[PDB]
Subunit: 168 residues, 4 copies
């Protein structure tokens, strides 16, 4: 129950906020990863819309909400959709389940939906630390490649906020 790859499990979660939650997520092999700016922007933006001025600005915001809602729905109604499941996520890496096992050292990108109303996916380049199967299937232990100052700060804030939300 996690101790089927204790070495990685410790590297990814020891002494750091590690959340256990259900969300669409998966590992995709590729030499073509994503961008840090993009992931940072996505994270901070989700957070900034946490919860006025001249009427024109108030109605501009109403228009924005309508646009986001429409576009949000169009994507969610045609996208492939990632495998929904229980994952263990920290600023260092993620413990999720994938269709097939992978050799440790396999490069790629972890794809996850940080929010469920918004179908925008978070793409984080990562490598496999371990690939042990038993939850009937193959579980992956992915280690994110260095995030950089900004993205890492965003991710910790995201996880911290996500945790308190859950702790209530």
């Amino acid at each position: 129950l996690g101790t089927l790859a204790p070495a990685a499990d410790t590297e990814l979660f020891a002494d750091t906020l590690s959340c256990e939650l259900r969300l669409p997520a998966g590992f995709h092999v590729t030499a073509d990863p994503g961008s840090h700016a993009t992931a940072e922007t996505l994270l901070r933006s989700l957070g900034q819309v946490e919860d006025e001025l001249p009427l024109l600005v108030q109605r501009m915001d109403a228009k924005l909400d309508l646009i986001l809602a429409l576009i949000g729905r169009l994507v969610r109604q045609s996208d492939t959709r990632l495998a929904l499941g229980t994952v263990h996520w920290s600023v260092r890496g993620i413990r999720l389940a994938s269709p097939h096992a992978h050799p440790p050292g396999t490069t790629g990108s972890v794809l996850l939906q940080p929010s469920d109303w918004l179908p925008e996916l978070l793409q984080l380049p990562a490598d496999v630390l371990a690939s042990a199967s038993d939850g009937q299937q193959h579980w992956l232990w992915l280690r994110f490649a260095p995030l950089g100052t900004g993205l890492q700060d965003a991710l910790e804030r995201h996880l911290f906020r996500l945790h308190r939300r859950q702790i209530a």
Copy 2:
């Protein structure tokens, strides 16, 4: 006013429409058993946003060149354009609901349905609130009554609790539609 359809399900019609603003109108409406409404906040946001943008204007095209610079008017124009284009995109792929006469209140709705459904059936009422915006309002609901009048199967649906925010937005929406229907009369 005074549609005898209520005589098909007296107790249901009373539950949904007695002592509350109940509007009889025509608009794209439907009911589906296999739900997927989303959140109360999405429905609430749609209704409120829709209200802020609709109901004509203050009969003036100015108001912007004053109090506001010009870079912002440009931005507002672009939003109007994007919104219209996104609405155009949607009409391209989405299956539209069929037009029908319905009786709508904050509690539920009475509408015609292709197939009958026994009371107790759970699902979602689908409605296109606007007209210029191809967006659907989905509201989880239960079938209170099901009856026929001879050519159409009628359903009386009671909405699942809407929550403070959405309820408020719907009440405002209904109140608005009402004065407007009476207005252009």
Copy 3:
């Protein structure tokens, strides 16, 4: 253009004593009971005019305001608008591009089939070439004639209302101005 001699009465009703522009653009008439929306038409026209604006001689960087954040927001809007435009152009049924005669009162355009005077429907046309947004205006056929090659229709827009009418008049005037260049 001598197309007017095919229906003098209709041509006079639509273009006499008012600004009338002869130009090429996608435009069509479709028999329908779609009441369209004055507000939608007015919004499209005024918004279009706002973005078709400036970038004239004070182009490049017409700086006057201050906030840098708002400038970035405006850049984002330009990018969004451009992409959304492309998407719509993917699976949308394009209109027929032909020469037309347009005034605040109605329009003369080519049509697949002729129609009896009094036939009501909607005139559809693409105001700007760089954006796939269409303007819809309820109209009735005044005249219907052929030049031996095509069916020409003279459509009279139903009352536009004060706001839409003003927007359309502004639209046609700028259009006329723009084209009297060189």
Copy 4:
């Protein structure tokens, strides 16, 4: 690679910033493309959102009203989402090395074309944005080396604004390149 068309390489890259990079690009033989305005809007807008990337991280964190900051966030979300939608059904352009100047571009085409062929150079300027830059161009040289067919496209006059935008874009491209 380049001697294949001495005169064409001198006309397009002599005494002017020329960058060597890899990105989706292609030449499409079309009757008439156009719109410098659309091309300039794209480059100028890209640049502004490109600088929004780190470097002081912000001209002023709080600054304007909080409602504004949040509307800006929604914009980021909308752009991302629409970008994702565009990718669901668009056609990617082959990645390739190209030499690009404000005057023209040299790229690898799946076929050759005679000098005078006209159309549009198609480029995807930013990896994060699925938007293509289209610039009317003519072919002034087509030659083949080992395998690939190489084309020398000479942009049709860009006009004051577009030219400025492209020169700025290329300079930023260059500067960022030196930052390896």
